[PDB]
Structure 1
């Protein structure tokens, strides 16, 4: 038998017909079609009144999306007696084998029925439903001249990995609450279920801490290249969390420590050995900054920050960073990370950290390693301690240029085009681990505008999202590539300023 790898498409990028991404466990199509008309309602039915009420909110979110493009006014009904032309969302009789996020979605001529185990699974199923309707459905304004049809079809689905996330760096360049909500919204449509916020680094501090107000008054006032920066009040952070919760997306806030701390060090002189504030940094160097690992003021600071963040962040996880502490000795890093893990745990939070944080003698088996290095020795500690691992290999570093000539992006992990972002498995990063899942990281050294985010995340994130959701045995670049071509108008319709990758 003959085999080959993909080259660039001759003559440039290529960028009744459903376009499901990520690929579901099974999808069959039969004869006939359902027609969504102006008289459609969404019916919801759970196993008890509380569950029905949650399904009602989900139904309303779906109706809002459908109404924007159809111009209809579909409303939602608490009833288990759907009428012909209805969409029906239910958790009654869900297939347990499909888990919390799984669903069956069966479309007949008279009715769409989505059956899940939990409301979360109805929400994930709804993302598929939107992809079964014609391109045009994802428009934010009314589309005319398109019959809103769904082929008679049968889908069963569930994720391969529990953790399927996106990180946005808002420290290097700041993005508004609206901009952050948009990226959360867009990612949710591809079944991303985790959003990691990199809230602080050398060039800026982005979260209001009432007990240390100069973190904002001084530490938020810049960014890479010297713009004005910005920050989130605690009320704004809560709003982001709430918006994410409506999409069954867990928000994990990161305060990076003991390295990548210049913004805090520039805000408070007492955090520095010489008692003087550091100058703010607007360059892109990494590795040089450190908290004082043997000063109690350091641990008081971390505790105040953790206390306030814990109060407003319902996720059971807090990310404490731990990458590139090149100005911290191995012994002091071990000690430091153990102390801050104890603080986090006392405030009811489990710690996530970049490698090599798993090597801290103060880590517990409840701690989580974010494995970005992906070397043979990375996560040896995590594995021995029974710590879950989230992988972020080169293929998940979405800030990497697509090609040598990309006008934005970095290249320290090589170039990562749409194909590279697809052709990998989490076990390529680490073997012998309990892999919790995958996280796409969008660092923002070189990204200033919303269009820059769109360009780098789309289509790269679609590739990563399928690696997280679809089983390895069912992943195939030739298949995905052709599906991606088909999906292109949907990206256009959503207003995503994607890169038309020539490998697609």
Structure 2
């Protein structure tokens, strides 16, 4: 047998009775004869195992109706009833197939009815992302589309994720993005079954979360960014609003306050956090590794506790991310000590700790701690594995801030180039052997990204590749297949208003 790898498409990128475009690829998908037609008289019916579950499904139904109404121009409403009428969409958790887990679902479309059967409301929400992809391109428009018959082929889908953790990180410290901009990225990612959003809220160039007991973190530490723009910050109310928005999409928000390194913005806000008692100058360059909290000063741990206390109060995720990357101004002994102490503080506030490697090596880590493995070397996470810690993988292939190509107008290249193909052609088991792999996280660092258009360009289509790696089983993943599916999907990216890169490899 003969095999080959993909080159660039001759003559440029392709991204430059019915055809559904399901991404990530579902466990199974078959189509039969006939079609369902969505008309102006359609209702969404919802039915759970009890009234409280029905009420939760009702909210999900209303979210679905909102999306359908925006493009069809209909006014589809939601009904609490297990007696759907011909032409209805029916969302139910009664009789879910338990083997599909919390996020799985069956989605069966007949001529008369669309029925989505799940174990839990979360699974109905994920299934709804598939439903939107079975309708014609045009359905994902934010304004009314005319001349398109709203049909769904008679079809049968069963589905469930391979990995529990499928995440996106946005760096809002290097360049600030508004609550609206962040909500938009959360919303877009949710449509591809991303279920975790990690916010990198502080770094050397900015501090982005209001801490009432240390007001100058905002008054001074939020006032810049990379390149000397004005920066910005989230009030605690705005952070809660982001969390609530994500919650409606069954997305967990994990806030990160990076320590002991990547801390210049804090050090520039409060002089007492520095050995000489003087505030650092703010930094607007892109250097890393130079900053450190004082590992042996009690003021450091009072500061960390106040931050953790306020953040824990407003962040319902059982996890807090305490960073731990590139502490090059911190000795190994001090790092080990520091990270163990802050893990004890977090645990006292009822939060488990996520940290970048090498944080798993801290003797104060517990088996409830989580390692975010970005280095992905042979020895990374040796400690985590020995300790029974869950591992989230973020290899070069998930570093979505990497240039697509040598000539990309934005992005970094310290992990080489990451085009859509590279973002696809890997498996979490490649990154670490012998570990409890919790899942994948796509990291969008923002040293070189200033506008929403820059975010869009780097995340799309790259994130789509990463999202399939998290959801779809390795045995069902194939670049030649995904590539062709991605071409088919392109008009939907257009319709959503995403300023994607038309990758020449697609």
User: 1:389, 1:96 → 2: CA distance?
Assistant: 26
User: 1:412, 1:338 → 2: CA distance?
Assistant: 30
Residue 455 of structure 1 deviates from its aligned partner by 0.1
Partner deviation per Cα, 1:265-307 (whole Å, 9 max, x = no partner): 0000000000000000000000000000000000000000000
Residue 356 of structure 1 deviates from its aligned partner by 0.1
Residue 78 of structure 1 deviates from its aligned partner by 0.1
User: Any gaps of 5 or more consecutive residues in structure 1?
Assistant: none
Residue 232 of structure 1 deviates from its aligned partner by 0.0
User: 2:226, 2:463 → 1: CA distance?
Assistant: 24
Partner deviation per Cα, 1:104-148 (whole Å, 9 max, x = no partner): 000000000000000000000000000000000000000000000
User: 2:420, 2:433 → 1: CA distance?
Assistant: 24
Q: TM-score, normalised by structure 2?
A: 1.00
SS of residue in 2 equivalent to 1:369: strand
SS of residue in 2 equivalent to 1:333: helix
Partner deviation per Cα, 1:66-124 (whole Å, 9 max, x = no partner): 00000000000000000000000000000000000000000000000000000000000
SS of residue in 2 equivalent to 1:420: helix
Residue 478 of structure 1 deviates from its aligned partner by 0.1
Partner deviation per Cα, 1:157-204 (whole Å, 9 max, x = no partner): 000000000000000000000000000000000000000000000000
User: 1:382, 1:464 → 2: CA distance?
Assistant: 23
Root-mean-square deviation (CA, aligned residues, Å) is 0.1
Residue 19 of structure 1 deviates from its aligned partner by 0.2
Moved over 3 A (4+): none
User: 2:313, 2:399 → 1: CA distance?
Assistant: 31
Q: Does 1:476 align with 2:478?
A: yes
Partner deviation per Cα, 1:428-456 (whole Å, 9 max, x = no partner): 11010000000000000000000000000
User: 1:225, 1:75 → 2: CA distance?
Assistant: 48
SS of residue in 2 equivalent to 1:113: strand
SS of residue in 1 equivalent to 2:424: coil
Residue 371 of structure 1 deviates from its aligned partner by 0.0
User: 2:431, 2:170 → 1: CA distance?
Assistant: 21
Partner deviation per Cα, 1:27-56 (whole Å, 9 max, x = no partner): 000000000000000000000000000000
Q: 2:460 aligns with which of 438, 458, 461?
A: 458
Determine the structure 2 residue equivalent to 1:8.
8
Partner deviation per Cα, 1:394-442 (whole Å, 9 max, x = no partner): 0000000000000000000000000000000001110100000000000
Residue 463 of structure 1 deviates from its aligned partner by 0.0
SS of residue in 2 equivalent to 1:445: coil
SS of residue in 2 equivalent to 1:421: helix
User: Any gaps of 5 or more consecutive residues in structure 2?
Assistant: none
Residue 332 of structure 1 deviates from its aligned partner by 0.1
Q: 2:325 aligns with which of 323, 327, 352?
A: 323
User: 2:435, 2:154 → 1: CA distance?
Assistant: 41
User: 1:427, 1:157 → 2: CA distance?
Assistant: 21
Q: 2:419 aligns with which of 413, 417, 420?
A: 417
Residue 350 of structure 1 deviates from its aligned partner by 0.0
User: 2:384, 2:97 → 1: CA distance?
Assistant: 33
